[PDB]
């Protein structure tokens, strides 16, 4: 178990005495696939699209395999994921967006576009300002300002590699990663449990939100009996990341507390 693939491959990218890889040591690798692979031989002639792909495809592999948050990927975290089968059946596939999981085009092109799309200010970042320039609506601005306030990794602005993470958990709350950034977000304190405050904290911005749409907002008690039962956690007053990823509904319970559009839409 130490010389099977997944360590060869880490001795494979890895800087000399590192058993360990950074997002840096998959860019020869990712640029070796944009050169060779049928489906994305017309990247060549856009050298500008390259980085966005090859950055988008970092951010997707690190987001499934990386599952410890440490920005350093062992062999262990590659092994318990589909990243070489992936590599595997890269190399037989034509049709880079059959590909769904990591190098999918269309997938890297949406992801680009909505970037865009953002972007009001023009500026190739996206801003605390942009999100509420877009959509009012959507999140709340103290769900915001916890992934602006490194939550989930002050400048103020968000990269667009930051901004992969963000778009691919807001669309998709139930896979696991996905749970934790919502996780770390809603856990101010960081003690690994969502206590009432917090909850309370992040449930005011909805009410005012409500309000102000001529709504009257469900209050917290009935709220919380609501969201308790949803979650089935094992202390009464301590829900903890297990308990949500557990319960499968993570996806309900993130909306009710930051996302006025999708809770309204239930
Ligand atoms: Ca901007
Ligand atoms: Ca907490």
Request: proline share 5%; charged share 30%.
């Given at each position: 178990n130490h010389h099977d693939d997944a360590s060869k491959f880490i001795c494979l990218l890895a800087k000399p005495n590192c058993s360990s890889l950074?997002?840096?040591?998959?860019?020869?690798?990712?640029?070796?696939?944009?050169?060779?692979?049928?489906?994305?031989?017309?990247?060549?002639?856009?050298?500008?699209?390259?980085?966005?792909?090859?950055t988008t495809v970092i951010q997707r592999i690190f987001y499934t395999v990386n599952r410890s948050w440490s920005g350093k990927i062992t062999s262990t975290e590659i092994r318990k994921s589909n990243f070489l089968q992936t590599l595997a059946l890269l190399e037989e596939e034509e049709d880079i967006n059959q590909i769904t999981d990591y190098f999918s085009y269309e997938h890297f092109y949406v992801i680009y576009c909505k970037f865009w799309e953002l972007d009001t200010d023009h500026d190739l970042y996206i801003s605390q300002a942009d999100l509420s320039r877009y959509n009012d609506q959507a999140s709340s601005?103290?769900?915001?300002?916890?992934?602006?306030?490194?939550?989930?990794?002050?400048?103020?602005?968000?990269?667009?590699?930051?901004?992969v993470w963000f778009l691919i958990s807001e669309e998709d709350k139930r896979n696991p990663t996905s749970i934790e950034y919502w996780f770390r977000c809603m856990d101010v304190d960081g003690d690994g449990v969502l206590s009432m405050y917090e909850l309370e904290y992040f449930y005011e911005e909805q009410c005012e939100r409500m309000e102000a749409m001529g709504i009257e907002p469900l209050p917290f008690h009935d709220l919380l009996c609501q969201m308790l039962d949803l979650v089935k956690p094992a202390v009464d007053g301590k829900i903890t990341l297990r308990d949500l990823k557990r319960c499968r509904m993570a996806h309900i319970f993130y909306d009710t507390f930051f996302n006025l559009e999708k809770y309204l839409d239930h």
């Open positions: 950074e997002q840096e040591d998959f860019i020869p690798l990712l640029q070796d696939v944009v050169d060779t692979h049928p489906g994305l031989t017309f990247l060549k002639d856009a050298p500008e699209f390259h980085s966005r792909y090859i601005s103290r769900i915001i300002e916890r992934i602006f306030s490194g939550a989930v990794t002050k400048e103020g602005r968000m990269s667009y590699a930051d901004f």
